[PDB]
């Protein structure tokens, strides 16, 4: 029919970390290379607001006009559940389009890290998979990171959340060092961030012994 | 080049007065002997009551059916779950060059081939889990590996080379085919032709069609047995409508000196 | 894992009319091995059909040869009904005279 | 414009077990209430077959009819890389719509277990984290289960899979149990069946020490 919107959330790292910016993002494609000009607006718990800032045309391949907003909305602000929204008005749309997002609301839940050791069979070989068991949590937005002897590190993935019968998520972490730095005994330390976490941050320990 | 083989069944849930598992066996492609749960005995089949055979040939043949039996119904024990099973084996050996065996053993649960039973290590081995788990059954056993490996490597062939001697007569059997080759009106400007070939033994035959002399390839070929051994063939080619008295069907066979010619 | 049934019909020797013969079907290449297969005369089932072992090809799809004796006539009209869990309904194959 | 297809896959347990049925699915919605009727076909490797097996008409609440075609493939074919397709045909679409699924083909990678039991800190706690890490293996496709004193366990859930930096996958599975049953030495057994497992099946074992 017309072009579609899509209303993507804040990063949850930023969420937490002021320092970093927390952009709520409204992306709209399938725009009408006849009648490209958008008609944005914004309303913080049903009040507009005016701090907008629409980033220009960013067509692609297939003819079709790409366009997105940026708002930049506050810290607090989105950890109260306060309800955001994308009203996109276009002549190449009747009617206008409007996408609500917020925080996964609920009652939130304190994670709960562990960190578990390389296992018996898993030495032998040269590398080594130190895991961080990250349970207990709500929501699903929280940020996972290694570092070791102040220094962060890169050889690691990290599983999206599982919903825990419980109701609350859980996740895992498997970072890769090899055998000597192990047994070398140097300290690896597993970070967490999260909205319900004391001080938005807790990192636990993990070493020989 | 012939070869003596079983063809093991087994079923888990039968329905009633049919037989659990049963057995048929073969050389070449003749029919000898047959077995089931039921009556218990292996008795031979067709022509073969009238082999020239020694005494306790056939009782050798129920003991080691027997053996099979328990093994086959032993499997489903070991698979445990609930939906129905279908478990089959060939089994057997063909005579190779140098006075020498070569065995067969391979199995197929629910129509899939599974699990197979290597000659050298004396194990049975397949690598998907049913066949992990029947192998496991099997082969902690009353040495059942042992009966297997003798039943394979000693008394198959011992079978095998004591049918060629006395059952020359049935295996050397030659029956020429009685042929007719026929046409069908089927379409608007079509029509179908079809050879036959009627009563032949062996079963290796060639079917071919000629158009004023020159080949025609083959069109889909029909292959089966008759009641008593036999075999019939029929195949079958699409053709432009009042051009038929033109074709001509070819037929080869053992039991022929040369290639016939078989008019409409 | 589960297979259709392959209906062959066909005469043990050329047929003639007013002369003794068999009418064989020649069911094949199915699975599992429950089915039911029964001789028609025009439309109507015969009771003196004989029947094979039920035995497997070397693809490990069974088959089956049903098998009665008869004398056709010119009339007359056989066919070959074939049930199995494949099948939607019974299958019945008309006997071509020519095949 | 018209209706549109979707092409699942069998599942990974049913495609390494015989006893179960691996079903190549081809569900078609948004169809037309006006022309209903549909004609499906299929292509393994390109060769047609007939054993497809058709589900009756399944309407929903938004006047679509909802249309279901099952293939009961191969054990064997499936893993060869056999491609696969359904073929659908409407009057309700001009052209035919083809869909074509497979194996995530790839040289396969066997994959490597390990368990980890519950952390230090976790068993103050009345309840246990049984850790089963399944790392090094391709493809995706994978089945994980639990099983304790010859007998299955239900308090348990598995992270799908992640893409490990070297190519392969890797995954995590946190069954839960009770204090006192872990520490009266009960034996745990992580379960696992993949394409590429010796026997397309292996377990692991977790118990105190
Ligand atoms: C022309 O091409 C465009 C793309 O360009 C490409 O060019 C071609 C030539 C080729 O080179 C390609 O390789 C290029 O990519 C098309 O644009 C896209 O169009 C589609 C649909 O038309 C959009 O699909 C949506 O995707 C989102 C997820 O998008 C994220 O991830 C994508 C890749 O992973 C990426 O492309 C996006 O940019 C985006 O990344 C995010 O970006 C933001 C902004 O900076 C960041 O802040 C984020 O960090 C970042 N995230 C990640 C991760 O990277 C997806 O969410 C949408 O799903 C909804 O819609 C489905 C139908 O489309 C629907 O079925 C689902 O249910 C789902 O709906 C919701 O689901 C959730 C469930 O929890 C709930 O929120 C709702 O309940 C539910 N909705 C309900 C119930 O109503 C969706 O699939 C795509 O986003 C878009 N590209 C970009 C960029 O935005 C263009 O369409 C094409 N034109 C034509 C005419 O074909
Ligand atoms: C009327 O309603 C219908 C639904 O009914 C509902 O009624 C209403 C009233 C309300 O009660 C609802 O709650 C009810 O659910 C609509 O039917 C649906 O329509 C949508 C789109 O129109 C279909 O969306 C697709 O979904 C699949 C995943 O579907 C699985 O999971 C669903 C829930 O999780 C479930 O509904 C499905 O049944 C299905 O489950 C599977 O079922 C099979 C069959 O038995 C099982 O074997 C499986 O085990 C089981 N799996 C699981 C898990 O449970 C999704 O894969 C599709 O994504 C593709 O398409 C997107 C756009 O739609 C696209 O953006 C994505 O990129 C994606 O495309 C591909 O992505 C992958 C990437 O790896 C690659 O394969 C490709 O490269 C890429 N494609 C490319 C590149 O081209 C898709 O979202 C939905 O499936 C369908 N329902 C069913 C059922 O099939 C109906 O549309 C509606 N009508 C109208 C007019 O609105």
Redesign the interface.
Same mark, same amino acid.
């Given at each position: 029919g017309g072009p579609s919107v899509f209303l993507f959330p804040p990063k949850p790292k930023d969420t937490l970390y002021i320092t970093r910016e927390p952009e709520v993002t409204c992306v709209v494609v399938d725009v009408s290379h006849e009648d490209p000009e958008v008609k944005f607006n914004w309303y913080v718990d049903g009040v507009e607001v005016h701090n907008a800032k629409t980033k220009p045309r960013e067509e692609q391949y297939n003819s079709t006009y790409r366009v997105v907003s940026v708002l930049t909305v506050l810290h607090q602000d989105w950890l109260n559940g306060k309800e955001y929204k994308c009203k996109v008005s276009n002549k190449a749309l009747p009617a206008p389009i409007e996408k609500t997002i917020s925080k996964a609301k609920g009652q939130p839940r304190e994670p709960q890290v /562990? !960190? %578990? &050791?390389? =296992?018996?069979?898993?030495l032998t070989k040269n590398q080594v =998979?130190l !895991?961080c %068991?990250v #349970?207990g949590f709500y929501p699903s937005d929280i940020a996972v990171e290694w570092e070791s002897n102040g220094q962060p590190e890169n050889?690691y #993935? !990290? !599983? &999206?959340?599982? %919903?825990? =019968?419980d109701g609350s998520f859980? %996740? /895992?972490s #498997?970072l890769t060092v090899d055998k000597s730095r192990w047994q070398q005994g140097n300290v690896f330390s597993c970070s967490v961030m999260h909205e319900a976490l004391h001080n938005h941050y807790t990192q636990k320990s993990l070493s020989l012994s | 080049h012939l070869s003596l083989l079983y063809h093991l069944t087994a079923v888990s849930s039968p329905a009633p007065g049919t037989p659990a598992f049963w057995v048929s066996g073969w050389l070449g492609p003749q029919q000898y002997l047959s077995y089931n749960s039921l009556r218990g005995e292996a008795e031979p089949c067709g022509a073969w009551v009238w082999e020239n055979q020694v005494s306790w040939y056939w009782e050798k043949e129920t003991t080691d059916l027997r053996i099979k039996e328990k093994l086959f119904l032993e499997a489903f024990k070991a698979l445990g779950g609930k939906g129905p099973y279908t478990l089959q084996g060939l089994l057997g050996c063909e005579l190779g060059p140098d006075n020498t065996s070569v065995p067969t053993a391979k199995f197929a649960l629910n129509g899939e081939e599974f699990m197979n039973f290597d000659l050298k290590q004396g194990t049975w081995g397949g690598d998907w889990p049913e066949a992990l788990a029947i192998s496991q059954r099997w082969q902690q056993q009353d040495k059942a590996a042992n009966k297997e490996l003798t039943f394979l490597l000693f008394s198959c062939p011992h079978r095998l080379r004591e049918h060629l001697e006395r059952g020359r007569g049935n295996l050397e059997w030659k029956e020429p085919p009685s042929m007719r080759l026929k046409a069908r009106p089927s379409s608007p400007g079509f029509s179908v032709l079809t050879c036959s070939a009627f009563s032949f033994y062996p079963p290796e035959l060639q079917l071919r069609f000629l158009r004023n002399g020159l080949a025609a390839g083959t069109g889909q070929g029909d292959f089966g047995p008759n009641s008593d051994g036999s075999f019939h063939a029929s195949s079958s080619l699409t053709v432009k409508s009042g051009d038929e008295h033109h074709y001509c069907c070819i037929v080869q066979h053992a039991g022929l000196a040369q290639p016939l010619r078989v008019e409409l | 894992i589960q297979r259709t049934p392959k209906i062959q019909v066909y005469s043990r020797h050329p047929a003639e009319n007013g002369k003794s013969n068999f009418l064989n079907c020649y069911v094949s290449g199915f699975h599992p091995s429950d089915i039911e297969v029964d001789l028609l005369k025009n439309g109507e089932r015969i009771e003196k059909v004989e029947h094979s072992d039920l035995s497997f090809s070397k693809d490990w799809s069974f088959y089956l040869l049903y098998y009665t004796e008869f004398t056709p006539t010119e009339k007359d009209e056989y066919a070959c009904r074939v049930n199995h869990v494949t099948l939607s309904q019974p299958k019945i194959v008309k006997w071509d005279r020519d095949m």
């Open positions: /562990y !960190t %578990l &050791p390389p =296992s018996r069979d898993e =998979s !895991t %068991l #349970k050889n #993935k !990290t !599983t &999206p959340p599982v %919903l825990d =019968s859980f %996740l /895992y #498997k | - | -």
